[PDB]
Amino acid sequence: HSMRYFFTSVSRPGRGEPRFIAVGYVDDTQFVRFDSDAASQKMEPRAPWIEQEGPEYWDQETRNMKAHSQTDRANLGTLRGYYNQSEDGSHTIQIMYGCDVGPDGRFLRGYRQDAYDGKDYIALNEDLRSWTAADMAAQITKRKWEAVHAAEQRRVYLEGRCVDGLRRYLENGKETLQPPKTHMTHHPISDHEATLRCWALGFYPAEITLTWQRDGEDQTQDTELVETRPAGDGTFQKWAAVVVPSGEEQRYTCHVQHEGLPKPLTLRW
Amino acid sequence: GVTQTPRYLIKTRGQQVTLSCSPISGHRSVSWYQQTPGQGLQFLFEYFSETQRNKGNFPGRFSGRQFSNSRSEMNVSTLELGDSALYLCASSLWTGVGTEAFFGQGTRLTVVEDLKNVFPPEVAVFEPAEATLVCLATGFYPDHVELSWWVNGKEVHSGVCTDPPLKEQPSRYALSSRLRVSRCQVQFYGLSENDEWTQKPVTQIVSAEA
Amino acid sequence: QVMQIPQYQHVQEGEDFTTYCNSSTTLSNIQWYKQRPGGHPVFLIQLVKSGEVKKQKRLTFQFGEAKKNSSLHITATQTTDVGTYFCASDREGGSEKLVFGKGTKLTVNPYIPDPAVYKSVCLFTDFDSQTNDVYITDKCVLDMFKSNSAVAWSNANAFNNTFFP
């Protein structure tokens, strides 16, 4: 299990203050959202199990990512100075930090990765004692965060407060935070060729694997695989298709690999 | 490097009392602290970019604000006897965890029962017989003295013994200081021009020549 | 909530002002404030969770190489070290910004002593380090170093509760 905090800080050249869309993703489920353009200017709950948290917690979180919003404003200014970019550009600071836990709730591995304008600006390694870098601006951020040992404080957060809140959400979300349908639909394409689409629905998390195996041989040719598309209510969707000649429907099957499946189902329509 | 004013404001009960803090240049977070001797450093409320991010456990009569230049001011309305504390400003370069919260010089607020209870200090430098000099600041209230013993116009600090002061009737205070060699000057930052006088213990720079 | 265990610690100018700051809820940083008497808490240093020890001046800071621990050590204490040393803890998750320990009032003794008790003034001066209507002043030191001058006065014996010229 893991808790991801994705931060987006797209600046606006004179259209107002930088947008600070910030979200919380414990496992593959969003539970808290912060929108700098939202009317409430508050921590809108995004999960049925986080609406039970106390108003003190909500005030703490909303003050915290208001502070993070102004932090991203200042960081945008500093980076625009670093990259020597003009203020007329809509620059983005996208920040993700998070912490991994085992089934026992014990901390496994912490994440803190930063990206400016798409490129991976700076990230926290697996040790959680030092940072990575990509360019000279990332070198300046490296020097600043190693002079004040920002890595130590970030690691403290990740293996302290991060995992504490994560496991608290676990007791909050036993029924939700912790099974693809696999319809195996077919649609004719041509008298000599056809495509088979096995329709996996409502599986959580998104670590699905579809391979389109034929009882021993691996196929990646003509097996186009779409990205892990969520359905909207926290689950995800996945499917794949194979270009095959018509009339051999029984010869091709897809194998499903999901955490929620007791056994990997295989359909042979 | 935090400049905080006023230093020893002595407004009585009620009143409004505005305390100003100018954080270190670039510090965008200001934290407000009350040093009551009975409770130590108590968190009042913290200001980061014109907003009350963190607030302590204090009544609504403890209010503050922050300006555009990150300077912050606090207001303490309807004062009672329990507010005679050294109010402190903690300037953090950034809000939240992980920032060195430097401290301002402090505002030694005193909630006097009534303005008449404020007196200037009677002063007497005493001859060395031995060569110790004693500058008895006497009968002042409150304990807002900064006696530092200018012998020839400059601070000395060779010997001070500013008593960390005795009460006359345990409540006017009285302070003693010591200086040794082979004049003194006691600063009572007292009442201000804003405070009215019905009997004036203004801030007197009172000395004694020897 | 931090627990600075030595609420007060009267030592001499020799050594040993360990002011261990017991705490739970592992501290992201501790910081250390030397509140000079009648003054503001001067920031000494922030001990980020790098563990290890830091050696600012002759003082020895120590942040525990583990969760929720800290310490401090003056080693060779002196007269200028007198003050209420304060803990702090930003402690991610706390509504209050810095939770302070209740302080550690550090007082020292010079290791000088010929006691002598001198309106008029009565001055108890140059007495021993262990020498713990009428108004008497608590003993204070002259870091010139002869120190320990006490004052009594009213309107020669004075301190009924040593040389008496």
């Binding site: 905090y5 915290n64 502070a67 965060w145 957060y157 | 965890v97 | 991610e92």
Partner: peptide
């Protein structure tokens, strides 16, 4: 549970 720490670029 959100990081109270804000390290600046």
């Amino acid at each position: 549970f959100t990081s109270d720490y804000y390290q600046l670029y």
